[PDB]
Structure formats: structure tokens, C-alpha cells
Design a binder for this molecule. Structure first.
Ligand SMILES: CC(=O)O[C@H]1C(=O)[C@@]2(C)[C@H]([C@H](OC(=O)c3ccccc3)[C@]3(O)C[C@H](OC(=O)[C@H](O)[C@@H](NC(=O)c4ccccc4)c4ccccc4)C(C)=C1C3(C)C)[C@]1(OC(C)=O)CO[C@@H]1C[C@@H]2O
Ligand SMILES: Nc1nc2c(ncn2[C@@H]2O[C@H](COP(=O)(O)OP(=O)(O)OP(=O)(O)O)[C@@H](O)[C@H]2O)c(=O)[nH]1
Ligand SMILES: Nc1nc2c(ncn2[C@@H]2O[C@H](COP(=O)(O)OP(=O)(O)O)[C@@H](O)[C@H]2O)c(=O)[nH]1
Ligand SMILES: Nc1ncnc2c1ncn2[C@@H]1O[C@H](COP(=O)(O)OP(=O)(O)O)[C@@H](O)[C@H]1O
Ligand SMILES: [Mg+2]
Lengths: 429, 441, 368
């Protein structure tokens, strides 16, 4: 049995994870009490992946909840699926980080992380075989960027042979939501790059465009954006829970997707997304999904993959399909658009197919891609970063908590080198 | 849980405080007698939010506030008004003499004999908390109390409590309108002292609001019972994320980080866009864009300082009510597209956003209308250096002849303290200039 | 930076082992003096390689026998000359398991390696040039890499079930990478050097395996810092011009297949880590050899602590020498070929060495 630990840090991770447990609870037929009210039996064979069992045929999710303010947590408890979480796994404090990475990593979060790890060490030992960890957080704030990367270093040292799969919201290019995004993200990227195996880069600006152009939602709230991310989180681990023709897992996706140990930042996606009124006008076929998967405008990364080259991509399908229709179509993409694919990887596409689709769709698809267009995200932050650091714009709130100017230069060099390591593979000579 | 102490000093503080707790009681369902009949009708809930109101077992809800004047008149309105049964009777009216609009009186002579009580009741209030987030000092430049007593107090709290946010909400002196001859001195004196202890001082001038109420609310002859209701709303938006639910919550240490680049330029402004009458509540949509653009209008600032003569460093936008995030992102981009709004080269992000789901409430008898969404802006601009210069020139004109000085020496001040405080404001005038110089290589 | 110092490569053929005598192994590596020929035992295909220097310790009485002191006086002594000139210097070993890298560098008590001769010759040269004009200051450190963690060899541990306190690496903008917290000890004489070396080698991790009963299961870096403080003809302060030099002498671990040296657990774990580090080093060498041919190439320094801390030696600013160590047994012909290929690929590396005057951007800059 393969099992996963979920960790929800901050206001962005918890508001996502709550929908993740609101989505997963639907595929497995669990109601908000923790009781099973399903129809099929495949909903129970591998329930041990995300959930643990209880006395009266009740199922408690193996989730961990972390923040530095109680507001995020009381929303979960006072909500649709609040009761299922183990109340001893709501870990929190007071006096939030203040969008200061220094406060989440060194000063305040350090006084709370020991309680967090004890909950981790309990859940992990209750598992038969641990596969990996699942973190949902945000870059741009203090808690998710500081308290998250603090846990990552600790879990990695304790569990170095397991996968650390990290879902992360990156800062947008046009409009910020904090002033100190580039300081906090650069310091977080310095830690993720060294202490993860696969991290999925999500951007809120792209999710607005997806809701705008495809779903035709002109008043999209955060409950809808997270309703997109939660899908991708489900598609990745589908083949650990349901049966299929050609199986896959987190370690198999990593091996194919990650050629070098540092280039593990991905641009996710999900199909088939459509308007509620334009669903009875398209045929749901595998080639309809591939056209939607490799579309520049269905990526949640806010980077144009047509400004680079795909190093290796993946495609996790779900439903009754024909493997000729799947492999023939992934081939047509590589041969047609040969310039957006690396020359020294003859087949840049891994595949996976599951026989159990989502609750109300004949079939679904999930897309994971590693491209050199992520260059634009780390390059953009560095220009913001150095312009602020060249004059020490907001630095005196970070040094005041026990940081030096040296630690900023390290995060800049490592980020800038990664920018070149991706750019080393954009030229064809 | 999250708990803040509101302090109001002097007359400009109290008459604002009376408007605030008028509002805090309505949003939470509290009557003036401290009771909450809804909770016994409900059987649950913490709507008696322990940020601003402590609760006893008898059902009475007691506010976390201390305010003091050094004259007994204005508090005595409260000890005999409609809110007497709400407050703790420990309100400081040890004000047998006033500060006579003298710093030297609120900092020394009658600056003491009253402070040991003030620190004790605060320490009692803090000992009732499961965690503090900071202070909220409401005062006014120009007086002796709001200038002197505010400084002595801010000094002591920086020793006993230390690293706790201290947010000031002060009445900045206006360029033309003024109710005193010796305002320039008192402002430069406490500004010198409060600079090294405060973290973010939110400025407001009474001259801008007179025009806001004129043009927007269509009040042709307002008084301080109107100016102080708007100021009550600016504070509610700042402190809303500690009481009610929301999507993007904002704690008090987040203003300290995003709006204060360097430790000496922590003088931001404020405003409130959808300030409209009941009649003009019709005829308008009041979307996120129309409200957000108004906050950048130079005519709707609550401080008389044209931002077009300077550059923006940081801006925190706090939304309330039925607001969707995409509407904010689309709007903030529209502002960065407009060329009359120049940001410093070293701050390409510039904007912070905060969103809440509890709309504003309407104080009955008021001039503001009921709306579904409301916005509060907080900005740090280089234009305010012009206002510091006006005060320094007024200072120099009437200090070159040593006018009104013998009233300050008569209380214990030295002739040299004026210089020591004029030099620190001449260094501040440069730091605002050094920041605004675009970089080169 | 008006120079181009080519990395100087050497090769050393070790003699047959106990294991390689118990198994009746043949001889497949030969020399004709300066070249090195290798033959597959199948009589199918022959390869030849050429290096700047080549040593032959296969048999004591053969012609061309390059003993321990001859290897020293051929490779390490010029590095001491450049260290006295004012350059940073590096000497690093390479080879498969049991090739004899620890022997060639440190050696045994009755056969001192390169380090106990380098430091001794250094102190001796100082004793003849410690005149009134110039003084000398010497610091030493000796650190270890084990499972990608950094350890200090020149401290006396506490007593616990865990007494390997790990340090961390950092990147100074000007000086490059370094180790935070490393005990740098001021030295006075060769006897103190020897005491510290004894302590370090007793602290270094070792284990019995199927190819080395005393195996070198951790990378080891020996750093000397030499500062020559000289005096100009001055009307004022004497002793006013200093030159610094760092000497890095590096003994790395060998590849080691898991099936030949069959052992499970911690041995397997540290072998895996060793293998990873060696892979990254190979990538670095190949990338630098491709830089030498005019292509735009990215050097993966950051993928391992070893290359990260040796960033300034494999390239950068120092005069570098490599010592490949090989075995003549036919059973290890593939690993010998891989080592020799990486070694001859390393000859194409070019580093920009400069003198560390500590006077540029001060006065000698605009003087010249
Ligand atoms: C049956 C029904 O109501 O009709 C569809 C529907 O109208 C459409 C528009 C749905 C609907 O999509 C949305 O409304 C939506 C809005 C914001 C963000 C994301 C989705 C639907 O919600 C999506 C939903 O699909 C699912 O329920 C999947 O199980 C989904 N889980 C949930 O939606 C869910 C259910 C209960 C509680 C919380 C979430 C899922 C996706 C991936 C992996 C596992 C599960 C379905 C069939 C529909 C609705 C409900 C309208 C589509 O959604 C998906 C998953 O692609 C859009 O295209 C599909 C299918 C339909 O076209
Ligand atoms: N906005 C507002 N400002 C006020 C109010 N009352 C007084 N002020 C301002 O206070 C300034 C003068 O300082 P005071 O507040 O009177 O000084 P003080 O704190 O009372 O100290 P004393 O004069 O010694 O009693 C004037 O410029 C007024 O604009 C008020 O009710 N609302
Ligand atoms: N997708 C999504 N992102 C969010 C949500 N709430 C906050 N964020 C992002 O999270 C960041 C805020 O940082 P946060 O962790 O809340 O700061 P903190 O509360 O001090 O730890 C912003 O950059 C937002 O873009 C949400 O509901 N959905
Ligand atoms: N030239 C040589 N003369 C004598 N013995 C040698 C020679 N080269 C290697 N050896 C033997 O090889 C063995 C292993 O050498 P060592 O340097 O420990 O290998 P490793 O590379 O594993 O550290 C030593 O016991 C040593 O006796
Ligand atoms: Mg008064």
C-alpha cells in the first residue's frame, strides 16, 4: 500500500487543500462525517492512500494543517468538510509572519515546527509503505515560503529516499499581492531547488485566463481557481488509487520528467475544461484533449512554452480509451511541432492511463510539462530582486530577525544559474 | 487569539474614539450597556470578538481601551453620556490642568503625574490577552498632549513591550487651516521623538476631509461628528481581518513590512473611495474599478498633498464586501498603465491587496450610505516631503526671533532641543529626496 | 589574468594486489616511456594514451621506476614553487577502487606520500628565506565529505551515539565557495602538521570491503593557506605587502561496483553517494574540456558539495594538477579505460591563474 502525507501551510494551501479533500471525498464516496456512502468497490481498495481508517467504519484524512493565524483554520472547522480532519492536527499559533520570510523560517515558525513534525512522525509510522509527501503552499508570503521550506528541509533529512512533491503558487508578472514577493520567493526557491524532487509551479494570473477564455467565468472566486488545481493534484496520484492499463506513480513520473536533479519545475494543466453551455457541441475524444492539453493557453504556469523547448512532458489519462489513440497522438505532437522539443531526447512523452474516470466525465486528462520557458519566471524575480536589493529597499525587516545580506546573494546566484541551466538547452547548434 | 489595544490621547483622540466604539458595537451586535442579546438568543458564536472587547461571565462586553486627555471635560461627556455603562471607569481624567498647547507641558511638567497610571491599566489589559498584535494610538499633532504625552508614552512602551507594532493615527497640521499659532513647533518636537519608536504613522488632515464632505457627501457646513465617522471606517478596514472572515487576510505586521521601506519614511496617507450620500448611492454602479480609481484621485485623498508632485513607493489596498479578486487584478493593472502615477524604479511590485467578506455597516444618523463593497487605501509617497518643508519654514520664520519659546523653557525645555529637532527633519527631507532619485550605473 | 595555465595530468600504474594474485590476472597496461598503451586481453583492439607525465610503480627493479619521492619531485614540487610565487595550487587524485590514491597522496608511515613531503619541503624552503624583509604565516584545515555532508577532521569529538557535527557550505561573492565553521589552525612546524594529520586520518571514515580492507570511504580535502608578508623600501611602515596562496590537496574515493564489494546497509549508502559525486565530477571535466574548444557550455558545479567547494580549482583561478591511478589487471580494464579517458580529457582544461597580490584596486593596479 502506497500512502501520502498532505500538509497545508498558509492561507493559500488550506483554501486549496479544503477543496482537495472536498474533491477526493467525492471519488471515494465519503461524506462529511467520514462515513462511506459509495456505489463501487474500487473506492475502498486503495482508500489507505490519502485516508486512515477509524473505529465505526469512519475515515479520517491523513492531512496536516499548519498556519500562524487561527482564521484560516476556523474556516475549515466551520465549513462543509471540517469535521473529518483530526482536530489534533490543527497546528497553529498567533501573530502571523507578516509576509516576512525571516519570521516564518527563523523566529516564529521555528517555535512551532517541532509540534508539526511530531504529527508527521505519527502519521508516517502509521503507514505501511510511505511513497512521498504532498505540500500545498504559496510563494510571496512568509508562512508558506518560510514555514514550508523549513518543514521541507527537516522531512528531507528524516526521509531522504521518499518523494517530496510540492504544489506552489508563484508570483504573477503583472499585478503583485505583496510588495516583498521577489525577496521571499527567491529565498524559497533557494530551498526548494535543493530539497525537492518535483514541484508544480502554479500562477494565479493564468488561472484567471483559463476561467475567462475557456470556462467563460467573468466573476471567478478563489473557490473556483482551487477547483482547477485540486483536479491536477488528483490526476497525478490516480494510478496509485485506481486500476489501469499502463500504471504510473510519483517516482515514475519523476524519473522520466526530471533529466537533471535541478530542473524539476513543471507547468501543469488539465482537460477537458469547457463552458456549461458549450458542452453539447464538442465530441469528447482523445485528440480533443491533446489539442487542449498542449495548448499554450491551458497552462497554469504563466509562461509561454512556445518561447522555449519542451525537455520532457507527461500525460496522465483517465477512462476507457484505446492506447493506439493515445500513443499515436503523442507522436503526432512531437513530429509536427519538432522545434518545441529537445533533439537529444528521442521520445519526450511519458504516458499513463487509468480505467476509472472522474465522477461525471466519460474521460479526463492531466498534463505535466517541463519547459525552458520557466526561465522567464526566475529571471523576472531576479530583476525585481536586485533592483530592491541594490538599494536595500525592505531589507531591514529581514536582518532584524537574524539574517545577513550574504544569504540574499546566495539565493540570487543559485536562481540565476538555474536560469542559465535552462537556457543552455534552448539553442540548437 | 488576536487582541489589540486602542489608545486615544487628547481631544482629537476621544472624539474619534467615541465614533469608533459606536461602530465597533454595531458591527458585533453590542448594545451601549455592554450586553449582547443576540448570543443568548443564538446560543453560540464569538461575534463579541475578543480583539476589541473583553467579556465577563455576566454577559457584559467590556472594550479594550484606555483614553486620557489631561483635561476632564471631554471624558466627562463619556462618563455621563450614552456609553457610560460600556467602559471601565478607569479612564484618566487626572487633568486638573491642560497642556496649554505646549509640548513642554505634556512631555514634562504635567507629562508625568499621570503616566504611571496609564502604563498600569495597559499592563492589566495586556495581562488579559492570549497574545497581542500591537497598539493603536489616536492623537493629534499641534496640541501639547497629543504631541508631548504621545511621545513620552511611545518611549516607555518601546521599553516595556519592545517589538510590538505601534500604529499611530494622527491629525496632520494643514497648510492654510489651523486652530493654533504654535502648531509647527509641537509637530517638529514629537516627530523627532516618535520617529525612532513608531512603526507606521497614518496621516490625516482636517482640511482635505472638509472638501470631501463638500464635494461628495454634499454637506456644506460639517463639524467633527462627521469627520470622525470616516476616520472610524479607515480603522475598521485595517482591523477587519482580525475579526471577520476573508479570502486574503492582512495582519498588523503586514503594513509594517510592505509600506515602510526604510525605518524613517513610515509616514503613509489614507483615503476611502465610496464616500457617497444616500441619493448618489443610486445612479452609480460602485464596482471595484470605479472605487479603486477614486483612491488614486488627488482630490479624494484625506491629506492635502498632491501625489503627482512625487512618486509612489508602496500601496496597500484593503477591500471589503462582495469583491472578487480578478476585479482587483484587472484594476491594479489599469493604474500601472496610467502614466500620471509614477512608481520608484526600486519597487516594481508596489501593490498589496487585502479582501474581506464583511461589508461596512451604517452608523444610524450618519451621512454615508449603505453599499455592498468598500475600499481603504494606504500609500507612502515622496510628495509628503513638501508638507514637512512647510512646517520647517513656519518653524524657522518664528524661531529666528525666538517667539513663544519662553513658554516652553518655563516648563523645562532647553533652547537647543528646537535645533536638535529641526536638524532631524532636515535629514528627513533629504532621505525622501535620496529615495526618489532613480538609480544609475 | 594575463595567462592560461593548462591542467597538468599524470598517471600511475600500481602493482598487482593480493586479490589480483589469488585470481590469476594478466597484465594489460604497458608503457614505452612517456606513452601508456592498454590492450584488451582478447587480442582484439589496442588503445594508446599520451600524458604530460607517466609513472610506473609496477615493479621495484624495472627501468623507469618512479618511486614515491620521484612522484613527489615530479608533480608536487613545482606546485610549491608556484605557491611561493603567489599562485593558488590544487592537486587532486582520481581512479577506481583500490587504485592507490590514499597511498599516493598521504601514504604509510614508512612511505610518506605527497602531503608529508610538500609541507616539510615548504617549511624547509621557509627556513632559508625567513630573512628580515619577509615573514610567513601558515594556516591549515582538513575536511571530509561523507554522504554529501561536510565534516571536520581536526577536532576531538564528544562522546555520544552521534558525534559528527555537520557544517554547511556558503558562497561568498568575491572569494567563492567556502565552509562555515571550519577550524583553521595556525601551524609552526612539520611536527605539528604531522600531529594534525595523524588526528585527521584517525578521525576519517574507513571500512573493510571486498577490494580494500582499509577503504577510503569519504572525500578528503587538505587546505594550506600561506601568507608571505614582505616589505617595500618605506619611509614609514615596514611589512606592508602581502601575498596569499591556497594549496588544496584532494584524495577522492573510488567508483566501486555494489556486486563486487558485496555489502548492504551503510556501506551501500555511502558507495552510492560516492558514485554520484564522481559522476558529477566527470560531467564537470567534460564540460570544461568542451569550453576549451570554444563552445558555450554550462558547468554543473552546484550538483555536489565536492565540485561546489572545488569550483576554483577544476576551473577558475589556480594552477591544477591531476593524478590518475590505474591497475594493470585485465579484470579492471574497463574502469582503467574510463579513468584514462577522463584524465586525457582533463588535459584540455585551461584555468586563468593570477597572482594574489591584494594590491589590485589599491595601488599597483594604476602603478602598472
Ligand atoms: C455533472 C455536472 O454537474 O456537469 C459538469 C459540467 O457542467 C462541466 C462544465 C464541469 C463543471 O466544471 C465547473 O463548473 C468548474 C468550475 C470552476 C473550476 C473547475 C470546474 C463541473 O463543476 C465539474 C464536474 O466534474 C466533476 O464533478 C469531477 O468529479 C470533478 N470534481 C468535481 O467537480 C467536484 C464535485 C463535487 C464537489 C467538489 C468538486 C473532478 C475533476 C477532476 C478530478 C476529480 C474530480 C461536472 C461533471 C460538472 C460540473 C459539476 C458542473 C467541468 O469541470 C471539469 C472537472 O472539467 C467543466 O467541464 C467539465 C464537465 C462539464 O463540462
Ligand atoms: N479630526 C478631529 N480633530 C480634532 C478634534 N478635536 C480637536 N482636533 C484637532 O486638534 C488640534 C489641536 O490639538 P488638540 O487635540 O486640541 O490638543 P489636545 O490633545 O487636546 O491637548 P490640549 O490642547 O492640551 O488639550 C486641532 O488642530 C484640531 O484640528 C476632533 O474632534 N476631530
Ligand atoms: N490560488 C489561491 N491563492 C491564494 C489564495 N489566498 C492567498 N493566495 C496567495 O497567497 C499569497 C498570500 O500569502 P499568505 O500565505 O496568505 O501570507 P501569510 O498569511 O502571512 O502566510 C498571495 O500571493 C496570494 O496570491 C487562494 O484562495 N487561492
Ligand atoms: N605503488 C604502490 N606500492 C605499494 N602498494 C601500493 C601501491 N599502490 C597501491 N598500493 C596498495 O593499494 C592499497 C590501497 O591503496 P589506497 O590508496 O588505500 O586505495 P584507495 O584508492 O581505495 O584509497 C594499499 O594497501 C597499498 O598497499
Ligand atoms: Mg484638549
Amino acid at each position: 500500500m502506497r500512502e501520502i502525507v498532505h500538509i497545508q501551510a498558509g492561507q493559500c494551501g488550506n483554501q486549496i487543500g479544503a477543496k482537495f479533500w472536498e474533491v477526493i471525498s467525492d471519488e471515494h464516496g465519503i461524506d462529511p462525517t467520514g462515513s462511506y456512502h459509495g456505489d463501487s468497490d474500487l473506492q475502498l481498495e486503495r482508500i489507505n492512500v490519502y485516508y486512515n481508517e477509524a473505529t465505526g467504519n469512519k475515515y479520517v484524512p491523513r492531512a496536516i494543517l499548519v498556519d500562524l493565524e487561527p482564521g484560516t483554520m476556523d474556516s475549515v472547522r466551520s465549513g462543509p468538510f471540517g469535521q473529518i480532519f483530526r482536530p489534533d492536527n490543527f497546528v497553529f499559533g498567533q501573530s502571523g509572519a507578516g509576509n516576512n520570510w525571516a519570521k516564518g523560517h527563523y523566529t516564529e515558525g521555528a517555535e512551532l515546527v517541532d509540534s508539526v513534525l511530531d504529527v508527521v512522525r505519527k502519521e508516517s509510522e502509521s503507514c505501511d509503505c510511505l511513497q512521498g509527501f504532498q505540500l500545498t503552499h504559496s510563494l510571496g508570503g512568509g508562512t508558506g515560503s518560510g514555514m514550508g521550506t523549513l518543514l521541507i528541509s527537516k522531512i528531507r533529512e528524516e526521509y531522504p529516499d521518499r518523494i517530496m512533491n510540492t504544489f506552489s503558487v508563484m508570483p504573477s508578472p503583472k499585478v503583485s499581492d505583496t510588495v516583498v514577493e521577489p525577496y521571499n520567493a527567491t529565498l524559497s526557491v533557494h530551498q526548494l531547488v535543493e530539497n525537492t524532487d518535483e514541484t508544480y509551479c502554479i500562477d494565479n494570473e493564468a488561472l484567471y485566463d483559463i476561467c475567462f477564455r475557456t470556462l467563460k467565468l467573468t466573476t471567478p472566486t478563489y473557490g473556483d481557481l482551487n477547483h482547477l488545481v485540486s483536479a491536477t493534484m488528483s490526476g497525478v496520484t490516480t494510478c496509485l488509487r485506481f486500476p489501469g492499463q499502463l500504471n504510473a506513480d510519483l517516482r515514475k513520473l519523476a524519473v522520466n520528467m526530471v533529466p537533471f536533479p535541478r530542473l524539476h519545475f513543471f507547468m501543469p494543466g488539465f482537460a477537458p475544461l469547457t463552458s456549461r453551455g458549450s458542452q453539447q457541441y464538442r465530441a469528447l475524444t482523445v485528440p480533443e484533449l491533446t489539442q487542449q492539453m498542449f495548448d499554450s493557453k491551458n497552462m497554469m504556469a504563466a509562461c509561454d512554452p512556445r518561447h522555449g523547448r519542451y525537455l520532457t512532458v507527461a500525460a496522465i489519462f483517465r477512462g476507457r480509451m484505446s492506447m493506439k489513440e493515445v500513443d499515436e497522438q503523442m507522436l503526432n505532437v512531437q513530429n509536427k511541432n519538432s522545434s518545441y522539443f529537445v533533439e537529444w531526447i528521442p521520445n519526450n512523452v511519458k504516458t499513463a492511463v487509468c480505467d476509472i474516470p472522474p465522477r461525471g466525465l466519460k474521460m479526463s486528462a492531466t498534463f505535466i510539462g517541463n519547459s525552458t520557458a520557466i526561465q522567464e519566471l526566475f529571471k523576472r524575480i531576479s530583476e525585481q530582486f536586485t533592483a530592491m536589493f541594490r538599494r536595500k529597499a525592505f531589507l531591514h525587516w529581514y536582518t532584524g530577525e537574524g539574517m545577513d545580506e550574504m544569504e540574499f546573494t546566495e539565493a540570487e546566484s543559485n536562481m540565476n544559474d538555474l536560469v542559465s541551466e535552462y537556457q543552455q538547452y534552448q539553442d540548437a547548434t | 487569539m488576536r487582541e489589540c489595544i486602542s489608545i486615544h490621547v487628547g481631544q482629537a483622540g476621544v472624539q474619534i474614539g467615541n465614533a469608533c466604539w459606536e461602530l465597533y458595537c454595531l458591527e458585533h451586535g453590542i448594545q451601549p450597556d455592554g450586553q449582547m442579546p443576540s448570543d443568548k438568543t443564538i446560543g453560540g458564536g464569538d461575534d463579541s470578538f475578543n480583539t476589541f472587547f473583553s467579556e465577563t461571565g455576566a454577559g457584559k462586553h467590556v472594550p479594550r481601551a484606555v483614553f486620557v486627555d489631561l483635561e476632564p471635560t471631554v471624558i466627562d461627556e463619556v462618563r455621563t453620556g450614552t456609553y457610560r455603562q460600556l467602559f471601565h471607569p478607569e479612564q484618566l481624567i487626572t487633568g486638573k490642568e491642560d497642556a496649554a498647547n505646549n509640548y513642554a507641558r505634556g512631555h514634562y511638567t504635567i507629562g508625568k503625574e499621570i503616566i504611571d497610571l496609564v502604563l498600569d491599566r495597559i499592563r492589566k489589559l495586556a495581562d488579559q490577552c492570549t497574545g497581542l498584535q500591537g497598539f493603536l494610538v489616536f492623537h493629534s499633532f499641534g496640541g501639547g498632549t497629543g504631541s508631548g504625552f504621545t511621545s513620552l508614552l511611545m518611549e516607555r512602551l518601546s521599553v516595556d513591550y519592545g517589538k510590538k507594532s505601534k500604529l499611530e493615527f494622527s491629525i496632520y497640521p494643514a497648510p492654510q487651516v489651523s486652530t493654533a499659532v504654535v502648531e509647527p513647533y509641537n509637530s517638529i518636537l514629537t516627530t523627532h521623538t516618535t520617529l525612532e519608536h513608531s512603526d507606521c504613522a497614518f496621516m490625516v488632515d482636517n482640511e482635505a476631509i472638509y472638501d470631501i464632505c463638500r464635494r461628495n457627501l454634499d454637506i456644506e457646513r460639517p463639524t467633527y461628528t462627521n469627520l470622525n465617522r470616516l476616520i472610524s471606517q479607515i480603522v475598521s478596514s485595517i482591523t477587519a481581518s482580525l475579526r471577520f472572515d476573508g479570502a486574503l487576510n492582512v495582519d498588523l505586521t503586514e503594513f509594517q513590512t510592505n509600506l515602510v521601506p526604510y525605518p524613517r519614511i513610515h509616514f503613509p496617507l489614507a483615503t476611502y473611495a465610496p464616500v457617497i450620500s444616500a441619493e448618489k448611492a443610486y445612479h452609480e454602479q460602485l464596482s471595484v474599478a470605479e472605487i479603486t480609481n477614486a483612491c488614486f484621485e488627488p482630490a479624494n485623498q484625506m491629506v492635502k498633498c498632491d501625489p503627482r508632485h512625487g512618486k509612489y513607493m508602496a500601496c496597500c489596498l484593503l477591500y471589503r464586501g462582495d469583491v472578487v479578486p480578478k476585479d482587483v487584478n484587472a484594476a491594479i493593472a489599469t493604474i500601472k498603465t496610467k502614466r500620471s502615477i509614477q512608481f520608484v524604479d526600486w519597487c516594481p511590485t508596489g501593490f498589496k491587496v487585502g479582501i474581506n467578506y464583511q461589508p461596512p455597516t451604517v452608523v444610524p444618523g450618519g451621512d454615508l450610505a449603505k453599499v455592498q463593497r468598500a475600499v481603504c487605501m494606504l500609500s507612502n509617497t515622496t510628495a509628503i516631503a513638501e508638507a514637512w518643508a512647510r512646517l520647517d519654514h513656519k518653524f524657522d520664520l518664528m524661531y529666528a526671533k525666538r517667539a513663544f519659546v519662553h513658554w516652553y523653557v518655563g516648563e523645562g525645555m532647553e533652547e537647543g532641543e528646537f535645533s536638535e529637532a529641526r536638524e532631524d527633519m532636515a535629514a528627513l527631507e533629504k532621505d525622501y529626496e535620496e529615495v526618489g532619485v532613480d538609480s544609475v550605473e | 589574468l594575463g595567462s592560461n595555465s593548462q591542467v597538468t595530468v599524470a598517471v600511475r600504474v600500481r602493482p598487482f594486489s593480493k586479490r589480483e594474485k589469488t585470481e590469476k590476472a594478466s597484465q594489460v597496461v604497458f608503457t614505452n616511456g612517456e606513452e601508456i598503451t592498454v590492450e584488451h586481453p582478447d587480442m582484439k583492439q589496442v588503445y594508446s594514451f599520451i600524458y604530460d607525465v607517466s609513472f610506473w610503480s609496477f615493479d621495484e627493479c624495472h627501468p623507469g621506476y618512479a618511486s614515491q619521492t620521484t612522484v613527489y619531485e615530479t608533480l608536487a614540487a613545482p606546485l610549491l614553487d608556484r605557491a611561493f610565487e603567489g599562485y593558488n595550487t590544487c592537486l587532486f587524485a582520481y581512479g577506481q577502487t583500490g587504485s592507490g590514491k590514499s597511498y599516493t597522496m598521504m601514504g604509510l608511515n614508512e612511505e610518506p606520500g605527497i602531503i608529508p613531503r610538500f609541507c616539510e619541503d615548504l617549511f624547509a624552503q621557509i627556513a632559508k628565506k625567513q630573512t628580515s624583509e619577509v615573514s610567513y604565516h601558515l594556516e591549515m584545515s582538513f575536511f571530509e565529505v561523507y554522504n554529501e555532508k561536510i565534516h571536520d577532521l581536526l577536532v576531538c569529538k564528544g562522546e555520544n551515539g552521534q558525534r559528527k557535527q555537520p557544517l554547511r557550505a556558503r558562497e561568498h561573492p568575491v572569494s567563492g565557495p567556502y565552509v562555515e565553521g571550519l577550524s583553521m589552525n595556525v601551524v609552526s612546524s612539520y611536527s605539528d602538521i604531522q600531529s594534525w594529520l595523524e588526528l585527521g586520518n584517525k578521525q576519517r571514515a574507513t571500512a573493510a570491503t571486498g577490494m580494500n580492507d582499509k577503504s577510503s570511504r569519504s572525500h578528503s580535502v587538505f587546505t594550506l593557506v600561506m601568507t608571505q608578508t614582505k616589505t617595500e623600501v618605506v619611509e614609514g611602515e615596514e611589512h606592508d605587502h602581502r601575498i596569499t596562496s591556497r594549496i588544496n590537496l584532494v584524495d577522492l574515493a573510488g567508483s566501486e561496483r555494489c556486486s563486487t564489494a558485496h555489502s548492504s546497509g551503510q556501506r551501500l549508502k555511502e558507495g552510492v553517494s560516492i558514485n554520484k559525486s564522481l559522476l558529477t565530477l566527470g560531467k564537470v571535466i567534460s564540460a570544461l574540456s568542451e569550453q576549451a574548444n570554444g563552445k558555450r557550455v554550462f558547468i554543473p558545479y552546484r550538483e555536489s558539495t565536492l565540485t561546489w567547494l572545488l569550483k576554483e580549482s577544476l576551473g577558475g583561478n589556480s594552477k591544477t594538477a591531476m593524478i590518475a591511478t590505474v591497475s594493470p589487471a585485465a579484470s579492471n580494464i574497463e574502469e582503467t579505460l574510463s579513468t584514462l579517458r577522463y584524465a586525457t580529457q582533463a588535459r584540455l582544461i585551461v584555468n586563468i591563474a593570477k597572482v594574489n597580490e591584494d594590491m589590485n584596486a589599491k595601488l599597483i593596479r594604476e602603478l602598472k
